[PDB]
Amino acid sequence: EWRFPKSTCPGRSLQKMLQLNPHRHATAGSQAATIPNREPFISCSQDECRLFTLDHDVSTPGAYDGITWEDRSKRRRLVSFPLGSELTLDNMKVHLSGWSGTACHDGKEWTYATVNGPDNSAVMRLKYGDQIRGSFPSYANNILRTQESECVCIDGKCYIIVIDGPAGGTATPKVLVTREGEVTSEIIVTGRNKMGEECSCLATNRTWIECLCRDNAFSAKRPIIRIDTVAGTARGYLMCSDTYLDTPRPADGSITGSCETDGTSGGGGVKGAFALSRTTEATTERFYVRTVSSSARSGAVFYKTTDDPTESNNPLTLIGTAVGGAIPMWYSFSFEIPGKVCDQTCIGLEMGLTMGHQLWTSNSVAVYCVIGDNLDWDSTTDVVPADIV
Amino acid sequence: EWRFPKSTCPGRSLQKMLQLNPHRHATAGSQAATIPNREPFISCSQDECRLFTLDHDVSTPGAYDGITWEDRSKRRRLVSFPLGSELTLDNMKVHLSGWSGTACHDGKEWTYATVNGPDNSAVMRLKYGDQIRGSFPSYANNILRTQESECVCIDGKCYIIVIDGPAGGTATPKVLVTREGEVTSEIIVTGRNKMGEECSCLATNRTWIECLCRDNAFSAKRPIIRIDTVAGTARGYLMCSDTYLDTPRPADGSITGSCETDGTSGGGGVKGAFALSRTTEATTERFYVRTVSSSARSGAVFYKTTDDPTESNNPLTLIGTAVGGAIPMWYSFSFEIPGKVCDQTCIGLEMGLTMGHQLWTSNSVAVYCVIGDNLDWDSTTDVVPADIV
Amino acid sequence: EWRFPKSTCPGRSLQKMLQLNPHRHATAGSQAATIPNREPFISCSQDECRLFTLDHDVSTPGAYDGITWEDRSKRRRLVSFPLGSELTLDNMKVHLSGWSGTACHDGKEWTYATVNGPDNSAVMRLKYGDQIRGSFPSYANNILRTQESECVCIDGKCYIIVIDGPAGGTATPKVLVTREGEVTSEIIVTGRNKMGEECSCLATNRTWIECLCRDNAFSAKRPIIRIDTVAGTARGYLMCSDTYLDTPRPADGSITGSCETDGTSGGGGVKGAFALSRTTEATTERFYVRTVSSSARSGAVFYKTTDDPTESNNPLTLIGTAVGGAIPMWYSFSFEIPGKVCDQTCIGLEMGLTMGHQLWTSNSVAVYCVIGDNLDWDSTTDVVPADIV
Amino acid sequence: EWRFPKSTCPGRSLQKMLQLNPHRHATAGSQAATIPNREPFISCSQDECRLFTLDHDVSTPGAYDGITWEDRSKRRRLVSFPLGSELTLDNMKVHLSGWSGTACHDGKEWTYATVNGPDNSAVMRLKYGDQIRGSFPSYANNILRTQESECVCIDGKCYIIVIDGPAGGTATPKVLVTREGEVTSEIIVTGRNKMGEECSCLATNRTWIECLCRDNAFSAKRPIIRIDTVAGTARGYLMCSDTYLDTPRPADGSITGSCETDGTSGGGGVKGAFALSRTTEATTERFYVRTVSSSARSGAVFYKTTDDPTESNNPLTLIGTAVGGAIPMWYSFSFEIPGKVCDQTCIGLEMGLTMGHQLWTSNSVAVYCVIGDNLDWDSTTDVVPADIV
Ligand SMILES: CCC(CC)O[C@@H]1C=C(C(=O)O)C[C@H](N)[C@H]1NC(C)=O
Ligand SMILES: CCC(CC)O[C@@H]1C=C(C(=O)O)C[C@H](N)[C@H]1NC(C)=O
Ligand SMILES: CCC(CC)O[C@@H]1C=C(C(=O)O)C[C@H](N)[C@H]1NC(C)=O
Ligand SMILES: CCC(CC)O[C@@H]1C=C(C(=O)O)C[C@H](N)[C@H]1NC(C)=O
Ligand SMILES: *[C@@H]1O[C@H](CO)[C@@H](O)[C@H](O)[C@H]1NC(C)=O
Ligand SMILES: *[C@@H]1O[C@H](CO)[C@@H](O)[C@H](O)[C@H]1NC(C)=O
Ligand SMILES: *[C@@H]1O[C@H](CO)[C@@H](O)[C@H](O)[C@H]1NC(C)=O
Ligand SMILES: *[C@@H]1O[C@H](CO)[C@@H](O)[C@H](O)[C@H]1NC(C)=O
C-alpha cells in the first residue's frame, strides 16, 4: 500500500548515475525545442522517477526565452519529464502553474504543489492525481514559497515545508501535513526556527524526517529541521559542523560560539542537499555537498560524516570534487528512489547555464547516488551559453 | 463500473490549475510544430484528463495555417492531447473529422462525437472506443452542431446537446441519449426551448444534469437546460440573475420583466461556462464566468451564487478578475474531474490569439477549479500574434 | 482468447471517420519531419488500431526524399503509427525491412509480414510479436509480393494472400496459413486463379473470408477469392457486376459474355477495397469503391449491393462520391475494427500526392466506415505538391 | 518468473529483420534531431526489445556533434530506444553516464551497467530498475571496460564480461555475477585467458553461456569464453576454425600450429558476433560474421558451422554477403529475443558512417536473425557523410 522508508541499499560513497543536458541541443543548426528551466529536482514512485522543474512557458531557441532569469511570474509552471528523457517540448508534462514547487508520491498517487499568485497574497495549491485537493494561503503575505525539491510521504501522509516572510530576516517555516493533497494539519517548527528556505528532506528512519535548509539571512550554517511523524512535532536546529555548507560562508571553523551561534556574516545563501544511509531504526551515515568556492556558486564538493550534524562541530570527511571550481553550480537537491528490497538516496546538482544578469538562464542536472566506496568522476557541461541560439 | 456523479471535493472559490500556451513556441527561431486550434475543452476519465479541440490539419509555423479562422471545412478534426502535454504535432491524437465536437467517458470507454458534412446536410458520427457506433443526421438542415465541451455520462448512458437551425433565430436543441456511442433516444427540450447553442453541462446531483448555453438570437441572459436522466425529460429555462452572463449584454438588471423575458437586445453571444459544488442530493453553490467587457470578448470575471439560477434575479457575488479586460477571452467551458473519493468541477478559458479578421487564429487555455476560499491570480498569455512566424 | 469474426455493428452506408494528412506539415516554415510513404493500410487489435505503410527510410522535407516513387529497394520498411497519430518521424515504429507488406492481430500478438530481397529471389519473413517466426521463399522467382492491406486471423490462424510471377500475365496466388507467424500450410486457390494482386480481405461470417483483388493483366473485373478456413480450401471468382471496379476499365456492362469472361481490355489496374455487413452466418450487404475516372486514378465513388458478387451481373447501387474526380485517388484498402459487442468494417483511401514521374510521392489517408444511412461528405487534401519543400 | 534459455525457434540461416538509419534524416532541409552514437546493441525483455547505444550528449545536426569520434569522455551515456523507434532526441532514454556499456533483463527488471571515470581509476556502476545497486572498481587501473553488447541472465543472476589492462598486451577478463544489480561474485576465467575484449555472449543451453570476443593484441582468431553458471566456472579458448573472424587477419588457414596458437600477426581487432540454434541440452548450429576485407572494417559475410568452434579447424560454411565490401562495417553484436514458446538469436551490424579521422562519427544498425534456409538480401545505408549538415 502506502510508501514508507526502508533500510537503504548498501553504499559508502557517492557515484554518478546520469546527467541531463538539454541545451547541448540548442546550438546553431540544431533541431530541438529545449526547455529552459530552474529549480529542478527529482521525485520517484515505485514505477518511475521523474525530473521536475519550474519552466517559463517557452522553449530555447525562441524569441521569448529571455525571461528565463525571472523568479516569479504568471508564466512559470511546475513541469516534469520521465527521468532519462531529455528536456524537450514534446517530452514535457505540465502539472500546475506557479513559481515555487514540490512533489512526492505516497505509494498510490502523486501530490504536486506550487505557489501561485502575487507576492503579497500567494496561494499554494496541491494537486493529488488529477484533482486540486488542497489550498493553503499565504500567512505572512510576503512570498509564500516551498522546497524546490521533493516532499516526503510516510504511511499515506505527506510532509511539505513552506515559509513566508522576508528573505533577509526572520521567516518562520511550517510543516504542512497532507492526505490525498488536502492540508489536514500544520506542524509548528520549534527550537531554532527563525529561517529555513528551500529545504531538502529525507527520511532518517521508519518514522522521522530530516530537512537540510538555507538560512538566507543569519548564518552560513545550514538549518536542520527534524520531523517526528508519529508525534506530529518538528524542531529546528543549526548544523554544527565546522564544515559550513552554505554559500557565501567564512573559513571553516571560524564561527565562534555554540552550535546554534549564527556567526557574523550569513546574508544570502543557496539551496543545499544531503544523502544518507539508514536502517529502519537510525541513520548511520550522512553525505553532504557544498560549493568549491566560499563566495561564489561554483563547483561542488562531497563530504560525509557519521556524527549527529545537530550536535558535533567535527569537520566533515572529504569525499572529493564532483564539479570543478571553474564550473557554475547552483542548487542541489536530495531525493530518494524507493525499491522493493531497499531504498536509495541521491543528490542532484543544478549546473547553471546563463548568458548573464537578467539574460537567458537554465541548467544541466547531474545525479549522484549512495553506492560504492569512492567518488567515481566529476561532471562537466561542455555548454558555452554564448553558443546557445 | 459506470461513471456516476459523486459529491464534490470541498471548495468555495476558483483557483488556477495550469495553462497551456503552445504558440509561445511559434516565434522566430523556435523549433516546434504547434497546433493552432479553436473551440477547446477538457474531458476526463478516471485514468487521465485530455485537452480536446478542433484543429485545421496544419501546424504553426507553416504555409497553410492561414485557414485557422474558419468555422467549418473539410480540414477540421476533433483531436486531443493528454492534459499537460503541450499542443504540438507529435503529441496530437486525431479522433474524428468534423467541425463541431464533444466527448465524454462513461467509465469504460470514450465517446467522441463530431458533426461532419455540408451545412445543409451534416451528420453527427459518434465513435465509442475505436468504432463508429452512432450516426445522427441533420433534422433542420441548417448546420447541425453540438456543445464544443464535454458531454455527461451517468450509469452507462451519455447525454449530448445538439442544435440545428438558424443561428439568428429560433433553433430547437435536442438531448441525444447514447449507449456505447449508439443514439438510443432523443429527449425533447420543453419550456424555454427556442435557443441553446454550445451548452456547458455538469451533473447537479446523482441523477440530474444542468447545461448553461448561449442564446445567439434573443437574449443576453443565458439559457439553462436541466435534464432528469431517470425520467428522461429535459426543460429549458432562462438564467434569471441581474448579472447577465453573455457577451454582448446590456447593463446589469436593465432587462425589464420576468425571468424568461428576453430583453430588447440579445443578438450574438459567446459560449459560456459554470462550475459547482454538490452533494449526492443537490447543488449547493454555483460559480460563473463572464467577460470584463459588456460589448467585446475580452477579460474574464468569476462570480458565485447559492441561489437557484432559474428563479432568482439576485445579482451574483463577485469573486474577481481571472483575465484582465485588455486580454482577449473567447469561449469558456465546464468540465469535471472524477475522483475515487470526490469529484471536482472546473472552468477552462479560451484566451484567444489572432492576427485579425480572416487571418491566423488560435488560443491559450487556462484552467481554474473549485477549491479554496479566494481567487489566487489572474492569467495572461504574453503572446503577441505579430511575433508568430 | 483468439480473435474471430462477430456480427457487424448496424449500418447501411459509409460515413467518414478521420483523415491523416502529414504533408500539410511539410510546407515552407514548418517544423515537422513528415514520413512520405505509399501502400498504406490499417489493422486493429482489441486494444488499438494502427496505420501501417511502406516507408523509404527518409522524412520530408529532406535531401533524400526523391526516391519515394520507387516500388522496391533496400530502403523500404513496413512501419506503423497508432491510428490518429500524425505520420511524423518520432511517431513511427519500424517493424520489418521490405517492400510489400501485410499485418494482422490474432487476439494475442501481431503478425507482421514483408517481402524482402531481389526481384528474382525475394523472401517473405513473418514476425510474431518481436520474433521472426516464419519465412517463405519466392516460388516463381518473379517479385514475390503480398496484399498491401491487413491479413485476417480466425481462431489463432492467420490467412495471407501472396502472389509471384509476371505482373502482365498469369500469376497464381496462394493462401498462406500461419500460426504464431510460422507458415503451417499453403492453400491452393482453385477456380478462376490466373491473377490476384493486392487483395483486400474480410471475413464474411464466422468461418469464411472473401478477398477483392486486382487482375493486372486480363480483366477490368476484379478477382474475388473465397477461403473456407474450416475445410482449408480457397476458390477464385471474377466479380460479375456490370459496375466494373478496376481502373482502367471499359464502360459499365460492355464486357460481353459470362461472369468469368475477361473482356477485351484489362491491362493494368489498381488495388481495390470493399466493406460489408454480416451476421455470424452470412454477409448481408457489401460496399464497394472505384475511381470516378474510368481511365485515371482519380476520385472515389461508393456503391453497395445485396447480391452475391460472384454470380450477379446487376449494376451496383450508387452511394455517392467520396473523393471528387479532380483529386488523385490511388489504392484503397479494407480493414476491420474488432469490438466487444460487434465488429465494424471500413474502407481507407490513399489520396495520392506527387510532384510527377520519378519524383517525390506520398499520400493522405481518408477512412470511411459502415454506419448510418447516407454518405456524409467527400474528402479533399488541400495539399499542393509544389508547396512541399 | 526468471528468464532462462529455451530451445530456439526453427531456423537454418540468417535473414533480415529491420534497419535503423537515423542520419538519413540529418540532411539539408530535414527537421530531425538525430542521435549520433557508437557501440550499439540490442537487448530484450519478454515485453519489448530495445536498441542501446553510447551517445555523446548531442544531436545531429548541431554545433557540438564533432566530438562523436571519441571513445571516452564525460559526455557519453548509455541510452536506449524502443526497438523500431528511430534514433531521435525525443525517443531517447538515458540510463547511465559512462563510456562502455552493457544491459540485460532478468525476467523482472533491467540491469544496466556502464564504466565511468578516468582511464586509471574507472568504476562500473550497475543500475537495477531505477536504483544503482552495484559498483565495481577498476582492478588493473587501465581502462576498465565491458562488452558493448547485452549481458546474459539465467535464473535471476546475470553474467557480465569486463576487462582491464593494456589493449595492446595481456589483459585478463573477469565474469561478474550479479543479483538485482549487486555484484555477488567474480568468476576467474581459466585456460586461454590473456585477452578478451568486447565479448558477444549467448546461452548455449539451459545452463551454459558462450562468449565470442576480440583479442586486440595477439591473434586474428577470436577468443571464446564458456561459462558454466551452475558450477560457477569459466574457461577461455581460441576459435580454431581456419576461417579467422577478426579484422585485420591473415589468409584463411595460414596460422600454423594448434588451435590455441596465436599466429604471427594479431594486433588490432574489431568486436565480433555470432548466433546459434540450440535445444535445452546443446547448441546444434552456430552462425558467424566477419568483414569482407581482411584488412579494413568493410563488408559483412555470414558463415555457419555444426562443429565445436573450440576444437575444429574446419573452414566455416559460407552463407553469403550481408553487407557489400564497399560499405563500412564496424562492430557486430549478438542478441537474443525471448519468446513464450521459443527463443531466437540474432546478429546486429554497426554500419559505420563518418566524415573521417577525428570528425563526425555514427552508424546505421541492420539486424539479421536465425530463420529460414538462405540469406534473403544484403543491406546498404545510402547515407553519404558529406551530405550530413
Ligand atoms: C523569495 C526568496 C527566495 C530565497 C530562498 O528566493 C529564491 C532565491 C533564488 C536564488 O537564490 O537563486 C531563486 C528562487 N527562484 C527564489 N525563490 C522565489 C520563490 O522567488
Ligand atoms: C453556426 C452557428 C454557431 C453559433 C453558436 O457558430 C459558432 C460561432 C463561433 C463564434 O461565435 O466564435 C465559432 C463556432 N465555430 C461556430 N460554430 C460552427 C459550427 O460554425
Ligand atoms: C510488382 C507488380 C505489382 C502489381 C500489383 O506492382 C505494384 C504496382 C503499384 C502501382 O500500380 O501503383 C505499386 C506497388 N508498389 C507495386 N508493387 C511492388 C511489389 O512493386
Ligand atoms: C580501450 C581499448 C578498447 C579495445 C577493445 O578500445 C575500443 C576500441 C574501439 C574501436 O576499435 O573502434 C572503440 C571503443 N569505444 C573502444 N573502447 C573504449 C572503452 O574506449
Ligand atoms: C527514528 O528516530 C527517532 C530519533 O532518534 C526515534 O525517536 C524513533 O524512535 C525512531 N523510529 C523508529 C521506528 O525506530
Ligand atoms: C436531483 O435533483 C433533482 C432536482 O431537484 C431531484 O428531483 C432529484 O430527486 C435529485 N436526485 C437525487 C438522487 O437526490
Ligand atoms: C459461412 O458461409 C459459408 C459460405 O456460404 C458457409 O458454407 C458456412 O457454413 C458459413 N459458416 C457459418 C458458421 O455459418
Ligand atoms: C549444457 O552444456 C554443457 C556443456 O556441454 C553441459 O556440461 C551441461 O550439462 C548442459 N546443460 C544441460 C542442462 O544439459
Ligand SMILES: [Ca+2]
Ligand atoms: Ca546563509
Ligand SMILES: [Ca+2]
Ligand atoms: Ca446573446
Ligand SMILES: [Ca+2]
Ligand atoms: Ca485490370
Ligand SMILES: [Ca+2]
Ligand atoms: Ca586481433
